[PDB]
Amino acid sequence: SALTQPASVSGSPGQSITISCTGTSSDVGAYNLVSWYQQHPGKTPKLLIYEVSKRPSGVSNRFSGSKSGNTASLTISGLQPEDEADYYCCSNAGSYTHVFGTGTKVTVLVQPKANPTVTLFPPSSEELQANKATLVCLISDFYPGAVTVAWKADGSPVKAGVETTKPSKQSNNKYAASSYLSLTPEQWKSHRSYSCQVTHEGSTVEKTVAPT
Amino acid sequence: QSALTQPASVSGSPGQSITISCTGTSSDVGAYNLVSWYQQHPGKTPKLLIYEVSKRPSGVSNRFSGSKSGNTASLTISGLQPEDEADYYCCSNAGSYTHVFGTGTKVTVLVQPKANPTVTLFPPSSEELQANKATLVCLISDFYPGAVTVAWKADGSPVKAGVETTKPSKQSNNKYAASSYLSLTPEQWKSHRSYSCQVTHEGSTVEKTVAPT
Ligand code: NA
Ligand code: NA
């Protein structure tokens, strides 16, 4: 069973952050064999900590590790922009078996937090004339680069047919993403409205669209 | 702190060949002819595939082969089959009585054919126009691999100002999706006769056109 980590955390340059990683008494709690890895996208992982608290040669002392019960912790002090990466824990579940955490993305805040602009598009006429009814929810100009998207039909949940893209930085150094909802024309015309609800930093924006 | 470095995961198509790498040091992989390879399916006991770099036990298919060069060892799986989907681990002697193991590689077996993108061009929405904005969205979906080139036109003429295109991301069907949006004022939108989104993917081109109404 995988080890449990928070999906993300953020801090300002110079701050201290802490990442926790929770397992069971058969792995994290059974041995002092917890290791921490830093991975930038596309690069091989770098070992930061091994055996709970030991640093390999050449690893900065800004990184420290500890453990209490079935939870191991990685602390990063003096947060620097180069520390923006994915961090995952690893632990022995036995002599040869290892279990891995799900990874925590560390965001180093390089600009003010920005709530997203949300623009919802009904199906185009070309689309409906072709018996398609895809809706697109454009989400732009937000920071940091994480949002939660939920669709609705007449104020009821809709989970099937939804695809949301991973946020990516645009030219204004803010993040953009889109979510689209594949619908048949019958679904589109049988409801009074469809809604795209976008949540960012606990704040929620909902846009609504209706057949015409 | 020692471990043999393996890529976390690779993937290949049925029938093709893949090669896993296993990087050690001059004191283990590079020092001896004693690299082994194991295959493990979830919840099952590991199976020795290769020992002493390239020797194959009886009962192991000859589709598995091992080699090494310098401080890096390699396992090759020819004629990839669905049953080959598993975790693969390398190990090497670090000395007479010591051994180092690898971090493991998940081998996923999945057909991933090329696919040209579906392109849907959206004109400005009503609420957007009443807020004095007229963004156009070009939805680009269901393509593989994850690289496209988007070009916008107005009146058949190239337009690069005010366009943003998201980095393509893999969707639930293992194909990629992205969107390109063009930021206009309502006045710009109405002052043109035509707007077009042209998507290029592997020597294939799709152009969609929309006009104000
Ligand atoms: Na113009
Ligand atoms: Na045009």
Author numbering:
A (entry chain B): 2 to 213
B (entry chain A): 1 to 213
Give sentences from the paper.
LCs were distributed in two groups: a set of eight amyloidogenic LCs responsible for severe cardiac involvement and symptoms in patients (hereafter, H LC), and a set of five non amyloidogenic LCs isolated from patients affected by multiple myeloma for which no amyloid aggregation or proteotoxicity was observed in patients (hereafter, M LC). Five H LCs (H3, H6, H7, H9 and H10) and two M LCs (M7 and M8) were successfully crystallized and their 3D-structures solved. The crystal structures were all refined to satisfactory refinement parameters; in all cases the LCs were dimeric, with an overall quaternary arrangement closely matching that of the previously reported LC dimers. CL domains (res 115–214) are typically characterized by high quality electron density, are all very well superposable, and the dimeric CL–CL arrangement is clearly conserved in all the analysed structures (root mean square deviations -r.m.s.d.- generally fall below 1.0 Å over the entire CL–CL dimer - Table S3A and Fig. 4B-bottom).
The linker regions connecting VL and CL domains (residues 110–115) allow evident variability in the mutual orientation of VL and CL domains, which is described by the elbow angles spanning from 107.99° (H7) to 157.36° (M8). In some cases (H6, H9, H10) CDR3 (residues 89–97) participates in the interface; both CDR3s in the H7 dimer lack electron density, while in M7 and M8 CDR3 residues are located far from the VL–VL interface. Despite these fine differences, all the structures here presented, except for M8, display an overall conserved VL–VL quaternary assembly and association interface. Only the VL–VL interface in M8 is markedly different, one VL domain being rotated and resulting in an asymmetric VL–VL interface. In particular, M8 LC, which is the most stable LC against temperature, displays the smallest dimer interface area with the lowest calculated free energy change for quaternary assembly, compared to all other considered LCs.
